[PDB]
């Protein structure tokens, strides 16, 4: 729990289309993405995520 956190902007073309929700799912990273809600989510961690950019990692969009 120190290294491995080298992420960046996900590849939008790598996402496939989920018809039920109407949004993108990327099999390679396991990321969910909606350009409208602008939030991501990684189901491998089961976390609703958000690309900060500065932290170079996916921060949970679980604002409480």
């Amino acid at each position: 729990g120190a290294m491995g956190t080298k992420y960046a902007v996900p590849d939008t073309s790598t996402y496939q289309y989920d018809e039920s929700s109407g949004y993108y799912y990327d099999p390679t990273t396991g990321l969910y993405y909606d350009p409208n809600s602008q939030y991501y989510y990684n189901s491998l961690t089961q976390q609703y995520l958000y690309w900060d950019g500065e932290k170079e990692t996916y921060v949970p969009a679980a604002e409480s």
């Binding site: 929700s21 969910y32 991501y40 189901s43 089961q46």
Partner: peptide, 11 residues
């Protein structure tokens, strides 16, 4: 149900 859904899931 399962994991969460893709961002949105509106109506």
């Amino acid at each position: 149900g399962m994991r969460p859904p893709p961002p949105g899931i509106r109506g």
